[PDB]
Design an enzyme around this catalytic site. Sequence first.
Site, PDB file in Angstrom:
ATOM      1  N   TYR A 395       1.021  -1.420  -0.154  1.00 38.55           N
ATOM      2  CA  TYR A 395      -0.245   0.129   0.303  1.00 38.55           C
ATOM      3  C   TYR A 395       0.915   0.833   0.129  1.00 38.55           C
ATOM      4  CZ  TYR A 395      -2.888  -3.759   2.738  1.00 38.55           C
ATOM      5  OH  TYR A 395      -3.575  -4.515   2.824  1.00 38.55           O
ATOM      6  N   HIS A 475      -9.951   1.051   3.231  1.00 38.70           N
ATOM      7  CA  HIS A 475      -9.845   2.408   4.396  1.00 38.70           C
ATOM      8  C   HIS A 475     -10.801   3.667   3.914  1.00 38.70           C
ATOM      9  CE1 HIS A 475      -6.242  -0.296   5.006  1.00 38.70           C
ATOM     10  NE2 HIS A 475      -7.108  -0.700   6.046  1.00 38.70           N
ATOM     11  N   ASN A 518      -2.930   0.823   8.798  1.00 35.06           N
ATOM     12  CA  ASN A 518      -4.357   0.744   8.573  1.00 35.06           C
ATOM     13  C   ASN A 518      -4.890   2.021   9.715  1.00 35.06           C
ATOM     14  OD1 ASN A 518      -3.143  -1.913   8.006  1.00 35.06           O
ATOM     15  ND2 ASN A 518      -3.924  -1.847   7.522  1.00 35.06           N
TER      16      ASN A 518
HETATM   17  C1  LIG Z   1     -14.626  -3.248   5.617  1.00 29.63           C
HETATM   18  C2  LIG Z   1     -13.250  -3.079   5.951  1.00 29.63           C
HETATM   19  C3  LIG Z   1     -12.822  -2.726   6.594  1.00 29.63           C
HETATM   20  C4  LIG Z   1     -11.027  -2.537   6.831  1.00 29.63           C
HETATM   21  C5  LIG Z   1     -10.618  -4.082   7.056  1.00 29.63           C
HETATM   22  N1  LIG Z   1      -9.327  -3.920   7.846  1.00 29.63           N
HETATM   23  C6  LIG Z   1      -8.811  -3.294   8.827  1.00 29.63           C
HETATM   24  C7  LIG Z   1      -7.574  -3.486   9.782  1.00 29.63           C
HETATM   25  O1  LIG Z   1      -7.236  -4.469   9.892  1.00 29.63           O
HETATM   26  N2  LIG Z   1      -7.408  -2.834  10.161  1.00 29.63           N
HETATM   27  C8  LIG Z   1      -7.274  -1.218  10.384  1.00 29.63           C
HETATM   28  O2  LIG Z   1      -7.112  -0.342  10.142  1.00 29.63           O
HETATM   29  N3  LIG Z   1      -8.801  -0.961   9.367  1.00 29.63           N
HETATM   30  C9  LIG Z   1      -9.821  -1.488   8.725  1.00 29.63           C
HETATM   31  N4  LIG Z   1     -10.424  -1.656   7.825  1.00 29.63           N
HETATM   32  C10 LIG Z   1     -11.157   0.136   8.048  1.00 29.63           C
HETATM   33  C11 LIG Z   1     -11.990   0.755   9.520  1.00 29.63           C
HETATM   34  O3  LIG Z   1     -12.738  -0.931  10.004  1.00 29.63           O
HETATM   35  C12 LIG Z   1     -12.695   0.980   8.849  1.00 29.63           C
HETATM   36  O4  LIG Z   1     -11.777   1.830   8.192  1.00 29.63           O
HETATM   37  C13 LIG Z   1     -13.773   1.964  10.429  1.00 29.63           C
HETATM   38  O5  LIG Z   1     -14.655   0.743  10.883  1.00 29.63           O
HETATM   39  C14 LIG Z   1     -14.767   3.426  10.022  1.00 29.63           C
HETATM   40  O6  LIG Z   1     -15.498   2.636  10.873  1.00 29.63           O
HETATM   41  P1  LIG Z   1     -16.464   3.943  11.427  1.00 29.63           P
HETATM   42  O7  LIG Z   1     -17.327   4.626  11.873  1.00 29.63           O
HETATM   43  O8  LIG Z   1     -16.239   4.904   9.635  1.00 29.63           O
HETATM   44  O9  LIG Z   1     -17.741   3.433  10.089  1.00 29.63           O
HETATM   45  P2  LIG Z   1     -18.422   1.735  10.173  1.00 29.63           P
HETATM   46  O10 LIG Z   1     -18.774   1.416   8.657  1.00 29.63           O
HETATM   47  O11 LIG Z   1     -17.267   0.719  11.029  1.00 29.63           O
HETATM   48  O12 LIG Z   1     -18.970   1.910  10.723  1.00 29.63           O
HETATM   49  C15 LIG Z   1     -20.588   2.119  10.663  1.00 29.63           C
HETATM   50  C16 LIG Z   1     -21.967   1.969  11.208  1.00 29.63           C
HETATM   51  O13 LIG Z   1     -23.008   2.961  11.155  1.00 29.63           O
HETATM   52  C17 LIG Z   1     -24.327   1.954  10.617  1.00 29.63           C
HETATM   53  N5  LIG Z   1     -24.938   2.491   9.759  1.00 29.63           N
HETATM   54  C18 LIG Z   1     -24.556   2.818   8.546  1.00 29.63           C
HETATM   55  N6  LIG Z   1     -25.853   3.647   7.762  1.00 29.63           N
HETATM   56  C19 LIG Z   1     -26.502   4.018   8.751  1.00 29.63           C
HETATM   57  C20 LIG Z   1     -28.021   4.235   8.749  1.00 29.63           C
HETATM   58  N7  LIG Z   1     -28.526   5.131   7.615  1.00 29.63           N
HETATM   59  N8  LIG Z   1     -28.649   4.123   9.945  1.00 29.63           N
HETATM   60  C21 LIG Z   1     -27.608   3.711  11.048  1.00 29.63           C
HETATM   61  N9  LIG Z   1     -26.860   2.881  11.400  1.00 29.63           N
HETATM   62  C22 LIG Z   1     -25.861   2.982   9.635  1.00 29.63           C
HETATM   63  C23 LIG Z   1     -23.625   0.014  10.647  1.00 29.63           C
HETATM   64  O14 LIG Z   1     -24.070  -0.624   9.874  1.00 29.63           O
HETATM   65  C24 LIG Z   1     -22.267   0.495  11.098  1.00 29.63           C
HETATM   66  O15 LIG Z   1     -22.322  -0.489  11.926  1.00 29.63           O
HETATM   67  C25 LIG Z   1     -11.570  -4.987   6.545  1.00 29.63           C
HETATM   68  O16 LIG Z   1     -10.658  -6.225   6.908  1.00 29.63           O
HETATM   69  C26 LIG Z   1     -12.435  -4.690   6.127  1.00 29.63           C
HETATM   70  C27 LIG Z   1     -13.300  -6.064   5.109  1.00 29.63           C
HETATM   71  O1  LIG Z   2      -7.024  -3.163   6.884  1.00 34.85           O
HETATM   72  C1  LIG Z   2      -7.111  -3.956   6.163  1.00 34.85           C
HETATM   73  N1  LIG Z   2      -7.078  -5.357   6.478  1.00 34.85           N
HETATM   74  C2  LIG Z   2      -7.150  -6.746   6.033  1.00 34.85           C
HETATM   75  C3  LIG Z   2      -5.768  -7.668   6.490  1.00 34.85           C
HETATM   76  O2  LIG Z   2      -4.831  -7.319   5.628  1.00 34.85           O
HETATM   77  C4  LIG Z   2      -7.423  -6.877   4.522  1.00 34.85           C
HETATM   78  O3  LIG Z   2      -7.778  -7.719   4.298  1.00 34.85           O
HETATM   79  C5  LIG Z   2      -7.880  -8.399   2.636  1.00 34.85           C
HETATM   80  O4  LIG Z   2      -8.621  -7.516   2.590  1.00 34.85           O
HETATM   81  C6  LIG Z   2      -9.356  -8.333   1.001  1.00 34.85           C
HETATM   82  C7  LIG Z   2     -10.390  -7.818   0.798  1.00 34.85           C
HETATM   83  O5  LIG Z   2     -10.578  -6.375   0.511  1.00 34.85           O
HETATM   84  C8  LIG Z   2      -9.400  -9.453   1.318  1.00 34.85           C
HETATM   85  O6  LIG Z   2      -9.223 -10.295  -0.938  1.00 34.85           O
HETATM   86  C9  LIG Z   2      -7.578 -10.640   1.841  1.00 34.85           C
HETATM   87  O7  LIG Z   2      -8.000 -12.212   1.613  1.00 34.85           O
HETATM   88  C10 LIG Z   2      -7.562  -9.978   2.378  1.00 34.85           C
HETATM   89  O8  LIG Z   2      -5.895 -10.786   3.500  1.00 34.85           O
HETATM   90  C11 LIG Z   2      -8.355  -5.147   4.464  1.00 34.85           C
HETATM   91  O9  LIG Z   2      -8.346  -5.669   3.172  1.00 34.85           O
HETATM   92  C12 LIG Z   2      -7.620  -4.184   4.758  1.00 34.85           C
HETATM   93  O10 LIG Z   2      -8.711  -3.129   4.781  1.00 34.85           O
END
Ligand SMILES: Cc1cc2c(nc3c(=O)[nH]c(=O)nc-3n2C[C@H](O)[C@H](O)[C@H](O)COP(=O)(O)OP(=O)(O)OC[C@H]2O[C@@H](n3cnc4c(N)ncnc43)[C@H](O)[C@@H]2O)c(O)c1C
Ligand SMILES: O=C1N[C@H](CO)[C@@H](O[C@@H]2O[C@H](CO)[C@@H](O)[C@H](O)[C@H]2O)[C@H](O)[C@H]1O
Length: 541
Positions: A395, A475, A518
């Site tokens: 990244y 992110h 992250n």
């Molecule tokens: C999607 C995703 C994100 C990852 C991932 N990995 C990492 C990681 O390993 N480490 C990290 O630092 N960030 C990670 N990120 C990023 C991090 O999780 C996000 O940046 C972070 O959770 C963002 O927090 P926010 O508060 O901005 O927003 P969220 O989406 O988490 O939560 C919003 C919520 O409000 C809700 N909501 C949304 N719209 C709504 C509405 N109209 N009414 C009521 N509720 C609602 C939801 O359902 C939800 O629960 C990853 O694997 C995936 C698949």
């Molecule tokens: O912060 C993060 N951390 C997690 C862990 O590194 C990442 O996971 C990946 O997320 C991808 C989807 O965005 C997957 O396809 C992949 O298998 C999976 O390892 C995710 O994309 C990323 O948002």
Amino acid sequence: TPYDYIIVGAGPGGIIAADRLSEAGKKVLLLERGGPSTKQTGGTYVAPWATSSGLTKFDIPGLFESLFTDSNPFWWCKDITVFAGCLVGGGTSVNGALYWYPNDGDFSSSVGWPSSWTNHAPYTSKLSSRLPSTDHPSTDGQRYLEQSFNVVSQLLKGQGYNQATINDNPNYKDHVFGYSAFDFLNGKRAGPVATYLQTALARPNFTFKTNVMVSNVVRNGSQILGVQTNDPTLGPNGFIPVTPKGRVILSAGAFGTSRILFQSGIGPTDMIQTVQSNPTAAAALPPQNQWINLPVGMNAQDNPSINLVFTHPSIDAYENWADVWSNPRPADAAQYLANQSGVFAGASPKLNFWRAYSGSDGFTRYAQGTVRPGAASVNSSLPYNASQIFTITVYLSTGIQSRGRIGIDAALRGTVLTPPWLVNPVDKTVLLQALHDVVSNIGSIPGLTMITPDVTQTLEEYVDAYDPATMNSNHWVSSTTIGSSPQSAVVDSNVKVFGTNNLFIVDAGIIPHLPTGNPQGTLMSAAEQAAAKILALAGGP
Ligand SMILES: Cc1cc2c(nc3c(=O)[nH]c(=O)nc-3n2C[C@H](O)[C@H](O)[C@H](O)COP(=O)(O)OP(=O)(O)OC[C@H]2O[C@@H](n3cnc4c(N)ncnc43)[C@H](O)[C@@H]2O)c(O)c1C
Ligand SMILES: O=C1N[C@H](CO)[C@@H](O[C@@H]2O[C@H](CO)[C@@H](O)[C@H](O)[C@H]2O)[C@H](O)[C@H]1O
Ligand SMILES: *[C@@H]1O[C@H](CO)[C@@H](O)[C@H](O)[C@H]1NC(C)=O
Ligand SMILES: *[C@@H]1O[C@H](CO)[C@@H](O)[C@H](O)[C@H]1NC(C)=O
Ligand SMILES: *[C@@H]1O[C@H](CO)[C@@H](O)[C@H](O)[C@H]1NC(C)=O
């Protein structure tokens, strides 16, 4: 029933705000559109092997990769075109959980924070008291499935990197690698759901309602009167009011919050008109003369990322994570069931590394690697042993200049209107330099082979043929950025929406630039700070 604060969205931002505000004695309602996630929230989505523990797909770290391979993933927001968690915990219930305390530059006025935000230490410290970093999440203190760490550490040591316990010294990232850190507790996912939410739930002045979706805020000009939900048992036709001095905090995530604002007549005219095109949504808008023009969804930033896939004979690809839900390795399943140690106590990442790159445009950019066994996608013209694959995801983060745009389409889905990846040419240049450096000494490690891109395809060819959509790093930040003026920002130093008396935002949208690692650690520190600014802002409830 009126509330001093109505907080929309039980993600990290919302939960932390809810805890801190309720701790201060304020009457708080937290709303969440989705359902239960982990066991303690009432979740029951448990792997056959894990049955006796009650620990769900979200509870067990090692089930992380299976969040992407399930035949029926009910946790993704159904009206957003990219991954977003819509359940208790938001993204923190479905994420990789990589956890890096923010460094000083992540909160620098040079990346767009107001001066009053730069002293993040008290808040970051306070975050760490709720969610202590661990780079050995297994309850026995031991680390597991580390073969990819061992391989890439040797690669990196040949490039002049040094190992560190990353979170011990957040400011030192250049030429540093280390074991993956997570915000886990007792071998399970933790995050705000297991901490901040629990202390909130114990308070008589805190109320939490799930399966409630907020469509828009209801306002008389600059004065927000409450929120409009799809649950008529909570108020007249679903309307929930604030108390006279009360406030609404939006924490619905980059796509969630932007959509609620558009539906409230706040944002770029093109977006509000998109809402007006839906006759039902149009009826809830303020009249056009009260619309507030702010850059909601503009300035959107996400990390560009490029996956590099390798094999090495020492690697254990762990059946490419394909079997962890339905048919796990018996010993690993047994060990986790007994005391939450072993492979299942960590997510898939094993090693992380960072490196600083000078920019021809004056901006120092950081590259980050995340190393894990297995691979989502492989494109090799040559045979390979699938049991030996691992991924290095590269990244860019700090310093990048690319910006995109998020918003809604005519169906009111959250969508990427302008891809944010590699918009700025110097970002692409530095990415290719970063890729070239990673693989520069591959030949110095016996048996290490890069299989995607294979030997027939150059790194330059690979990046150019890469599907932009697949670069999504989940992110999203800066779509409602903090700043000093509505001419380039959406919220002020007190995270109040420009043009409003009592509308605030506490979620990733406020972050003005991607942090080095992250982002969830940065976000959660920011949420602590936000809550303090809101409490200190005169005229509140
Ligand atoms: C999607 C995703 C994100 C990852 C991932 N990995 C990492 C990681 O390993 N480490 C990290 O630092 N960030 C990670 N990120 C990023 C991090 O999780 C996000 O940046 C972070 O959770 C963002 O927090 P926010 O508060 O901005 O927003 P969220 O989406 O988490 O939560 C919003 C919520 O409000 C809700 N909501 C949304 N719209 C709504 C509405 N109209 N009414 C009521 N509720 C609602 C939801 O359902 C939800 O629960 C990853 O694997 C995936 C698949
Ligand atoms: O912060 C993060 N951390 C997690 C862990 O590194 C990442 O996971 C990946 O997320 C991808 C989807 O965005 C997957 O396809 C992949 O298998 C999976 O390892 C995710 O994309 C990323 O948002
Ligand atoms: C809007 O609020 C203002 C100030 O409180 C008030 O004067 C006016 O009557 C309100 N408008 C409506 C439609 O309620
Ligand atoms: C595939 O790799 C694994 C680990 O190196 C090895 O045990 C297995 O024998 C290999 N299979 C083949 C086809 O040689
Ligand atoms: C897949 O690999 C082949 C060579 O094995 C290469 O020509 C092709 O362009 C690759 N596809 C993409 C989209 O990178």
